Structure 1
Amino acid sequence: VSQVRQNYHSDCEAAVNRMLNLELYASYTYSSMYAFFDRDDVALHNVAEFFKEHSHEEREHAEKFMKYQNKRGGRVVLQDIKKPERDEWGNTLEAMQAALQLEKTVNQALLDLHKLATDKVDPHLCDFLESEYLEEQVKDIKRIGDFITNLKRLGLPENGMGEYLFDKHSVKES
Structure 2
Amino acid sequence: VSQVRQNYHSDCEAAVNRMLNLELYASYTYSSMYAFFDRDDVALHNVAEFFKEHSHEEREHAEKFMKYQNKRGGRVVLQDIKKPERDEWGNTLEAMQAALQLEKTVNQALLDLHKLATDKVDPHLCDFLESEYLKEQVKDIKRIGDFITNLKRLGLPENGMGEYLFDKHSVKES
Q: TM-score of the superposition, structure 2-length normalised? A: 1.00
Deviations 1:55-98 (A, max 9, x none): 00000000000000000000000000000000000000000000
Q: How do residues 11-160 of structure 1 correspond to structure 2 at under 5 angstroms?
A: 11-160=11-160
User: 1 CA distance for matches of 2:131 and 2:104?
Assistant: 18
User: 2 CA distance for matches of 1:153 and 1:91?
Assistant: 15
> Offset at 1:9?
0.0
User: 1 CA distance for matches of 2:33 and 2:128?
Assistant: 29
> Offset at 1:142?
0.1
Report the count of equivalent residues. Answer: 174
Deviations 1:11-55 (A, max 9, x none): 000000000000000000000000000000000000000000000
Instruction: Give RMSD over aligned pairs.
Output: 0.1
User: 2 CA distance for matches of 1:160 and 1:59?
Assistant: 32
> Offset at 1:132?
0.0
User: 1 CA distance for matches of 2:136 and 2:45?
Assistant: 24
Listed as ranges, the gaps of 5+ residues in structure 2 are none
**Identical residues among aligned pairs (%):** 99
User: 2 CA distance for matches of 1:43 and 1:101?
Assistant: 23
> Offset at 1:164?
0.0
User: 2 CA distance for matches of 1:26 and 1:101?
Assistant: 11
| Residue aligned with 2:39, SS | coil
User: 1 CA distance for matches of 2:43 and 2:135?
Assistant: 32
Runs of 4+ in 1 over 3 A off after TM superposition: none
Q: TM-score of the superposition, structure 1-length normalised? A: 1.00
User: 1 CA distance for matches of 2:20 and 2:29?
Assistant: 15
Deviations 1:151-172 (A, max 9, x none): 0000000000000000000000
| Residue aligned with 2:50, SS | helix
| Residue aligned with 2:5, SS | coil
User: 1 CA distance for matches of 2:136 and 2:36?
Assistant: 25
> Offset at 1:106?
0.1
